[PDB]
């Protein structure tokens, strides 16, 4: 994995030694070169994971998250270069440094062979995210949002530290490859109950779990566009990655510990989606949609059937692409009206037709239109949870109604109807913005041709 | 003060601490503490205002009371052991009195009640000495008497120091009291891992001294003693805001920084000894310390508070202050976690 | 640096260079007392170094190329706009007054640095001990607020206590009418707008507040407008003083060492001019502060430390 | 009154001074070369050669082999009269059971 970590670190001299007008073009070019290089991780086998060293390996779960992560950096650089154009050159280089450093932490978070190194990188991802939100966020509430984002994650994860060090003392190792073969069944006790909670609640917060999700409609909304892209597209999916790693060590206790949390998700996706029907802030509507979509990933990991893991990792990759594009579309209208009120700018298909078509495609992938990998993940999770209990389809199916309802209302409020009269600074769509939308949507639609690469280690 | 007299007085402070470190007799331990206090009193009264004299009076009373309890513990040790070796203590009453005396010298709760006062009353350099160098000699004696330290006593002092030093700094706008309550919390962290593995005690002491010296050196470089005066730094010295950012994110124990290193290792030596509740509660209580560190970083680095007009004059004068070891300490207090297995040099 | 504690250890004492001619002499008077030549005349008869009166661009004159910067980088204020509109909206009055107090504090630090490093006395014009005599003259004219007076008293309370008074105060008795006649013969189109009550309040805070409180800590010499014309009488009066008051008597090598370590660190001298008291006439918001700071960094010879700016022709930087 | 503050800077239009703006930069040469870099190393390189690379992955997670191997094994055990799959994954001759 050292053929990826070293170019990501060489992106630091590539942004701090660049000419003052070349610091976006060079970082975009070489980050796209790293993203083209990321395809070598697709050397996956049906039996063995691509095991590099004592420190790094990459199975078919971590590989699509890595390719999405290394792809997301050029898209964040294209997204965040317009509103940081009047910024000081040193703070501009510091912003690019925080994005590069966050990618650097993420690519060795997903390839951590050992779990306490996973913890160190997993909590290392807080600090560039916290600095990006609380420094380049636009409104007043970025400080409070950074506080909530920091202290939900740390309060969930400092018991995870004690739990992982307890596994290191008990089993002898926190290598995942060793613990595939030295896993002991976890019996029923209160000690093993709080063992389970300490191993799970950090990732429950990072997914987020319903009831614990209060950081997210502040952290995703008060962030800048690159912060919202990396928080929605990757940093939620650390929780699903970590749960899929750590429920190896939590059997058969998960079979009766998952019962409340599944309820919290199966009801939570009914609530948060319903919250999306009454959100006046468009960016908050996309945030609660992200909560509603990650509730299915929580359910699928907690029922721990193969169809559920295949659908959950397909839903993670698909929601990363779709939610990143929806935040970028909301930014494309925020850079024209300078407000996030959804009812303010209306009728935008009369003025911006191709950008309305990008809104249309992002809304159709949001509502899981087949054969998108959104629908492949959604459908496979629904199959596995019908196998879990035959009544859950009601909570699934009603969700698939409400998920349609706000996905098109967002399309009807913003793009359709009569245009707002007094708003006259609606510029034509830049080539940069349509490039951003196309680089989100075209990989998402190409993955419908060959979806087996985003279906996880048990395809 | 005469600089020759200042050099002799600082060498006498260092001499008293070294005499505590290198001696095998209890009378020489007591003599080292007496010499250390007697020499550090003028460092506190350097600027000659009533706050320094009040702070020196409070420091004298607490350290004199601790020295008397120390000599009483030594005398009871001579009763019940007939000898004077600096080693384990041969009476639980002498062990209790010496643990109380060293807790009073460190400022561990509920004997913490002099640390935010005195550090407020004295200059930043003398507070640097008080919070870094004056923690060395009682932790050396606690290193050498740990076969007789009562477990419930040292753990009560440790958790009470961590909780009280956590809830202290949340109400604080004065930077020296923030460093004082941070001192109380970190001394609780040092003494909690004491009876389990004193190498991690030494690691926590060294990393804390590095980070505290970095923060006091930044405070002396920017000449700021309040939060609201530290908030003027971005308009004067923008690099110093980045330095206080990374050092305060280090002091909260946030990975991938070096200040995550001690407490993690402390947990790494307490879950081996089947203590799971206690390092969990300690780690959750450290979030309070991290909260007021985040408050300081919000005021200084991550936002821009309004400055005044006269700051435009200070744009025309570079810093002529001897910021000794500030790049070295700033690098060591942030980027040392990949060198975590270096701790075996303290074994 | 050059001077420090090590030079005080290695024998660089300051009472060895302290001679009888080493006197810090402040000349004071009204806006047209004519003292501006008189001070210079004292400097050419006692062999002292003359510092001109601190204006907006004193710090510009002492740093960099020594040339005045644009006013948005230094001052952010105008004396002429104060003469035109003393009761203005934006608060030029106390902003100008606080900038002039900081500039005079820099001048007084330069004066003590020259006196304590060279043993040469310095003749000053309207030092920091006679700056409030304009301030109250503004506040008695309603030009500034009571909060501005409180901000000035806080900054003065934490800055003037670190210093010594001058040796000699030279005051010049000029009445208000002669001041106005010299202003009208001066021809300055903004200075002619100065009223009578303002000059009268300047004279009242001179005679009632300044000179009595300086009568203890130093030796005042008061002259009319015509007997300050003859410089040699004032020089003979200074040469035959019996310096027996003030805290200049108990100044040994250690105390003057501490004072010299103070006055050579200009950021330590100028530390408490910008105390975080959010007064609207002096508070600058973050966007304007950032904009003017980044524009000041773009100026030549101002981006780095002084011996490190390649664009103004610094060499050997890769070995510095 | 309140402090000395710069007023709100107005929103700039890139299409005024650069009517051929792609939106990457206000300098037109930097803007057009940023467009060329984004479109070449985004679409011509990563998307096109990425789809070619994923299209021709060498038997991704050995599924094709697994069909062909199954086509061997069925062909062995149709003719030899064996059942197509045993319900025992491992040989019961090499499993000891806890006696009761």
């Amino acid at each position: 994995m050292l053929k990826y970590i070293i170019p990501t670190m060489m992106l630091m001299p590539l942004t701090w030694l660049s000419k003052n007008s070349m610091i976006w073009i060079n970082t975009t070019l070489h980050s796209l070169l790293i993203s083209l290089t990321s395809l070598l991780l697709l050397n996956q086998f049906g039996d063995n994971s691509l095991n590099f060293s004592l420190t790094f390996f990459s199975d078919s779960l971590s590989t699509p998250l890595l390719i999405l992560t290394m792809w997301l950096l050029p898209l964040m650089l294209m997204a965040s270069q317009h509103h940081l154009s009047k910024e000081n050159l040193a703070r501009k280089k510091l912003f690019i440094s925080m994005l590069i450093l966050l990618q650097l932490f993420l690519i060795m978070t997903f390839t951590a062979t050992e779990l306490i190194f996973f913890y160190i990188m997993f909590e290392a991802t807080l600090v560039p995210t916290l600095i990006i939100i609380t420094r380049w966020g636009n409104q007043t509430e970025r400080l409070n949002a950074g506080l909530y984002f920091l202290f939900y994650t740390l309060a969930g994860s400092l018991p995870l530290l004690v739990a992982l060090i307890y596994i290191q003392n008990t089993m002898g190792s926190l290598n995942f490859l060793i613990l595939q073969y030295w896993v002991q069944p976890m019996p029923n006790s209160w000690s093993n109950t709080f063992m389970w909670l300490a191993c799970m609640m950090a990732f429950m917060v990072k997914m987020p779990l319903y009831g614990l999700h209060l950081w997210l409609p502040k952290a995703h909304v008060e962030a800048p566009i690159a912060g919202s892209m990396v928080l929605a597209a990757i940093l939620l999916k650390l929780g699903g990655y970590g749960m899929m790693r750590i429920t190896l060590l939590l059997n058969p206790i998960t079979d009766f510990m998952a019962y409340p949390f599944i309820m919290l998700s199966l009801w939570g996706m009914i609530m948060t989606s319903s919250i999306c029907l009454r959100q006046t802030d468009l960016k908050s509507l996309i945030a609660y949609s992200s909560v509603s979509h990650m509730a299915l990933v929580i359910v699928a990991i907690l029922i721990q059937t193969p169809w559920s893991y295949m659908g959950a990792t397909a839903l993670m990759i698909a929601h990363g692409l779709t939610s990143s594009m929806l935040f970028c579309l909301a930014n494309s209208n925020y850079e024209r009206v300078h407000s996030r009120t959804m009812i303010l700018a209306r009728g935008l298909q009369t003025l911006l037709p191709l950008m309305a078509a990008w809104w249309l495609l992002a809304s159709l992938t949001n509502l899981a239109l087949p054969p998108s990998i959104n629908l492949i993940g959604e459908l496979f999770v629904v199959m596995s949870t019908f196998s879990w209990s035959n009544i859950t389809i009601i909570l699934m199916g009603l969700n698939m109604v409400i998920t349609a309802l706000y996905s098109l209302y967002m399309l009807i409020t913003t793009q359709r109807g009569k245009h707002t009269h007094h708003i006259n600074n609606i510029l034509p769509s830049f080539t940069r913005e349509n490039a951003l939308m196309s680089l989100h949507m075209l990989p998402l639609l190409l993955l419908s041709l060959n979806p087996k690469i985003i279906l996880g280690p048990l395809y | 003060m005469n600089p020759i007299i200042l050099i002799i007085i600082l060498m006498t402070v260092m001499l008293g601490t070294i005499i505590v470190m290198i001696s095998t007799h209890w009378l020489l331990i007591w003599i080292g503490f007496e010499m250390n206090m007697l020499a550090i009193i003028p460092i506190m009264m350097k600027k000659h205002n009533p706050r320094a004299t009040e702070a020196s009076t409070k420091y004298f009373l607490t350290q004199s009371t601790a020295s008397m309890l120390l000599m009483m513990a030594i005398i009871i040790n001579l009763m019940f052991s007939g000898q004077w070796t600096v080693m384990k203590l041969f009476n639980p009453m002498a062990s209790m009195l010496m643990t109380m005396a060293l807790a009073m010298k460190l400022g561990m709760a509920p004997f913490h009640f002099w640390v935010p006062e005195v550090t407020q009353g004295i200059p930043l350099s003398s507070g640097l000495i008080l919070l870094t160098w004056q923690k060395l000699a009682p932790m050396s004696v606690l290193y050498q008497i740990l076969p007789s330290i009562n477990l419930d006593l040292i753990l009560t002092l440790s958790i009470l120091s961590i909780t009280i030093g956590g809830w202290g700094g949340l109400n604080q706008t004065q930077l020296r009291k923030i460093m004082a309550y941070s001192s109380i919390a970190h001394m609780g962290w040092m003494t909690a891992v004491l009876l389990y593995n004193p190498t991690m005690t030494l690691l926590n002491l060294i990393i804390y001294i590095i980070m505290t010296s970095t923060m006091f050196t930044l405070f002396m470089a920017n000449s700021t003693t309040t939060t609201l005066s530290l908030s003027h730094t971005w308009n004067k010295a923008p690099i110093m805001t980045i330095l206080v950012l990374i050092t305060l994110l280090s002091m909260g124990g946030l990975p991938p920084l070096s200040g995550f290193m001690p407490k993690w290792m402390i947990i790494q030596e307490m879950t081996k000894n089947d203590s799971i509740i206690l390092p969990t509660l300690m780690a959750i209580t450290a979030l309070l310390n991290l909260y007021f560190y985040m408050r300081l970083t919000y005021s200084t680095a991550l936002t821009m508070f309004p400055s005044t007009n006269n700051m435009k004059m200070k744009w025309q004068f570079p810093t002529t202050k001897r910021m000794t070891l500030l790049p070295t300490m700033t690098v060591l207090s942030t980027m040392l976690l990949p060198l975590t297995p270096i701790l075996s040099i303290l074994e | 640096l050059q001077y420090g504690p090590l030079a005080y250890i290695l024998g660089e004492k300051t009472t060895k260079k302290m001679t009888e001619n080493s006197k810090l002499i402040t000349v004071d008077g009204n806006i047209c007392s004519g003292k501006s030549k008189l001070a210079k005349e004292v400097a050419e008869k006692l062999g002292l170094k003359h510092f001109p009166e601190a204006g907006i661009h004193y710090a510009d004159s002492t740093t960099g190329d020594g040339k005045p910067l644009p006013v948005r980088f230094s001052g952010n204020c105008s004396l002429e706009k104060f003469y035109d509109d003393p009761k203005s909206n934006d608060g030029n009055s106390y902003r100008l007054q606080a900038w002039l107090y900081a500039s005079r504090l820099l001048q007084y630090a330069d004066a003590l640095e020259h006196l304590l490093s060279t043993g040469q006395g310095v003749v000053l014009e309207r030092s920091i001990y006679s700056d409030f005599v304009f301030l109250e003259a503004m506040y008695r004219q309603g030009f500034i607020r009571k909060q501005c007076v409180d901000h000035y008293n806080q900054v003065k309370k934490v800055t003037v206590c670190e210093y010594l008074p001058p040796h000699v105060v030279i005051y010049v008795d000029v009445p208000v009418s002669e001041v106005q006649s010299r202003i009208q013969k001066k021809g300055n189109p903004h200075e002619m707008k100065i009223t009578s009550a303002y000059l009268q309040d300047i004279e009242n805070v001179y005679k009632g507040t300044f000179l009595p409180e300086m009568s203890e800590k130093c030796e005042v010499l008061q002259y009319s407008a015509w007997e300050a014309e003859d410089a040699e009488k004032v020089v003979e009066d200074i040469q035959y003083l019996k310096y027996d008051k003030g805290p200049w008597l108990d100044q040994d090598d250690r105390k003057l060492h501490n004072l010299r370590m103070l006055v050579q660190d200009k950021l330590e001298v100028l530390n408490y001019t910008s105390i975080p008291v959010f007064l609207p006439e002096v508070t600058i918001g973050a966007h304007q502060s950032d904009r003017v700071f980044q524009e000041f960094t773009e100026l030549p010879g101002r981006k780095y430390r002084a011996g490190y700016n390649e664009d103004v022709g610094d060499k050997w930087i890769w070995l510095k | 009154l309140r402090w000395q503050e710069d007023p709100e800077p107005e929103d700039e239009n890139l299409y005024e001074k650069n009517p051929d703006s792609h939106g990457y930069d206000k300098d037109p040469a930097v803007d057009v070369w940023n467009m060329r870099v984004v479109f070449f190393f985004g679409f011509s390189i990563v998307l096109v050669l990425g789809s070619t690379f994923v299209a021709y992955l060498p038997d991704y997670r050995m599924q094709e082999w697994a069909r062909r191997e199954a086509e061997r094994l069925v062909k062995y055990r149709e003719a030899h009269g064996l059942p197509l799959m045993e319900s025992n994954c491992f040989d019961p001759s090499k499993i000891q059971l806890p006696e009761d």
Binding site: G137 | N171, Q172, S231, F305 | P276, G285 | -
Partner: peptide, 19 residues
């Protein structure tokens, strides 16, 4: 439309004797 930076009202909350 620019980035929010703290005003005098935000800054005076950090300038008391206690928090």
């Amino acid at each position: 439309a620019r980035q929010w930076q703290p005003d005098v009202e935000w800054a005076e909350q950090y300038g008391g004797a206690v928090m």
